[PDB]
Amino acid sequence: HWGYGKHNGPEHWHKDFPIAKGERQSPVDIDTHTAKYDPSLKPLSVSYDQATSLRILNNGHAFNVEFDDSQDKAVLKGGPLDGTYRLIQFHFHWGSLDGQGSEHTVDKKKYAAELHLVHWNTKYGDFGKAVQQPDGLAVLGIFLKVGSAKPGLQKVVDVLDSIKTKGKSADFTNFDPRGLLPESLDYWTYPGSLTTPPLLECVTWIVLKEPISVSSEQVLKFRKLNFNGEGEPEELMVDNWRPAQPLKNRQIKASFK
Numbered sequence: 001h002w003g004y005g006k007h008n009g010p011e012h013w014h015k016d017f018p019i020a021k022g023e024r025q026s027p028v029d030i031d032t033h034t035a036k037y038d039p040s041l042k043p044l045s046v047s048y049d050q051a052t053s054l055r056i057l058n059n060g061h062a063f064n065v066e067f068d069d070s071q072d073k074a075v076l077k078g079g080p081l082d083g084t085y086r087l088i089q090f091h092f093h094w095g096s097l098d099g100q101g102s103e104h105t106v107d108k109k110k111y112a113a114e115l116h117l118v119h120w121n122t123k124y125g126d127f128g129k130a131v132q133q134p135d136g137l138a139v140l141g142i143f144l145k146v147g148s149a150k151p152g153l154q155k156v157v158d159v160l161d162s163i164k165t166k167g168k169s170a171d172f173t174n175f176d177p178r179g180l181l182p183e184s185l186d187y188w189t190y191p192g193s194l195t196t197p198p199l200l201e202c203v204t205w206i207v208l209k210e211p212i213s214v215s216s217e218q219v220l221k222f223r224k225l226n227f228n229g230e231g232e233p234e235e236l237m238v239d240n241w242r243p244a245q246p247l248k249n250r251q252i253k254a255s256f257k
């Protein structure tokens with residue numbers, strides 16, 4: 001099955017998921033000089049004060065922190081979005097080295113990791129329905145660079161030892177995702193896709209301009225996770241990112257001058 005290795009990685013995904021060569025695939029390179037300021041954009045509304053985290057899971061491709069999305073508890077609105085998008089999970093992509101790891105790039109620069117907060121459009125009832133719609137998801141993307149530690153990330157880092165291998169999960173309640181946000185909500189936005197199979201073209205991407213900084217110790221603990229299940233040969237979970245895809249007939253819009 002699909003992965004990030006030499007024999008099942010991004011270059012192979014099109015064989016099972018032909019949409020991999022589609023017209024609105026993600027991630028992309030964000031060329032800052034060609035992104036256009038769009039005064040018609042509204043401010044982002046991030047309302048996470050009643051977020052209810054449930055669990056953290058190693059799914060063999062990344063680790064997901066899952067939320068109760070059966071009510072409007074943590075929602076994204078405004079910006080390019082019409083309607084209300086509910087937070088369902090967040091996860092990261094990261095590298096084996098500090099100079100790679102992000103999926104989006106900025107003027108071809110790669111960051112050490114990238115955070116994806118995944119939301120679905122409540123007009124579609126559930127996540128499974130939403131991924132089948134062109135405007136079904138909104139993913140908030142946040143770059144990570146290595147520098148000072150991110151205090152709000154440490155509770156995630158501390159539990160990773162309990163979910164080392166594929167299939168392992170742990171209780172993870174009362175986590176506040178607001179502690180993962182940068183100061184500024186300035187963003188770029190464009191229409192795209194899931195960056196993993198099934199690569200569905202259902203995502204409005206909102207990528208924040210300002211990265212958060214994490215410590216080398218924090219990202220080193222990401223790199224100790226395993227792709228494999230317990231009792232299988234150990235393969236470190238690193239470089240779980242898809243490279244930039246052709247922009248084709250798309251324009252990136254910026255919320256800022």
Ligand SMILES: CC(C)(C)OC(=O)NCCCCOc1ccc(S(N)(=O)=O)cc1
Pocket residue numbers: 116118128131139193194195196197198
């Ligand atoms: C039957 C099946 C599984 C083919 O249909 C599904 O319902 N697809 C479910 C979608 C699961 C993928 O979840 C994500 C993958 C990647 C991202 S990312 N890296 O773009 O933010 C988000 C969700």
Ligand SMILES: [Zn+2]
Pocket residue numbers: 091092093116195
């Ligand atoms: Zn992702």
